[PDB]
Symmetry: C2
Subunit: 132 residues, 2 copies
Amino acid sequence: MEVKEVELELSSEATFLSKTSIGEITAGEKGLNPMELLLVSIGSCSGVDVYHILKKKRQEVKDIKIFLKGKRREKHPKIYEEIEIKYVAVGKVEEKALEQAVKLSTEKYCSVLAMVKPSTNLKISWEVKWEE
Amino acid sequence: MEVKEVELELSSEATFLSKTSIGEITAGEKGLNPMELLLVSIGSCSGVDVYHILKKKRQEVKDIKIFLKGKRREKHPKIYEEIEIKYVAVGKVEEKALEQAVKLSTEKYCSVLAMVKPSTNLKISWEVKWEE
């Protein structure tokens, strides 16, 4: 069982300097918004999967853009009742390859996403932009 | 329903420049580890709650330290089977006030935590260090 550890310390009003393996970022009221950071965690975790899978499937990736939109419940806890994730692959990428990468990521590899899926309505979409 | 939005774009091998409301950070293989970022999201979201509650309860906060440790499953998806969160309040803070703040946060206010609770074993602890 791999262990991951982070440590936070107050840096300003309701804000924390958060220590990770690569460095420290400020998260909170006067720093990175925690709920936006959750979307970044989800997006990057999945993005890593899609990148590697696309590479394994011999696709030529010029760029990968991921757009995440979350809609929060009005009463506490204000969790995301819905999360829309749109993947856009740019380069010599076949739509079938991108679909496979996104599905494998969202249904098997993405650890961050697997932890929140049971508490929200996930809407996934993707598209390719053929470029040289 | 409040809407939160972030956008990611490839920045280096399996790494993404992630745009949020306050700026951009790199998340991925060569940037901030996505699963460590999840712990930062959880810690900061809860930290914001604890900070405000402690303030509302008239506690004198010199500092707030939060330590998060996650243990991952060995097969995919490698979610955290366990997440330990330890809160340490420093200053003129009564243990009862910290307990109340942590409980209200973890059981009612913390949005990030509420989304992952149903998929992991949460172990919470806290302690105060009386300081002037």
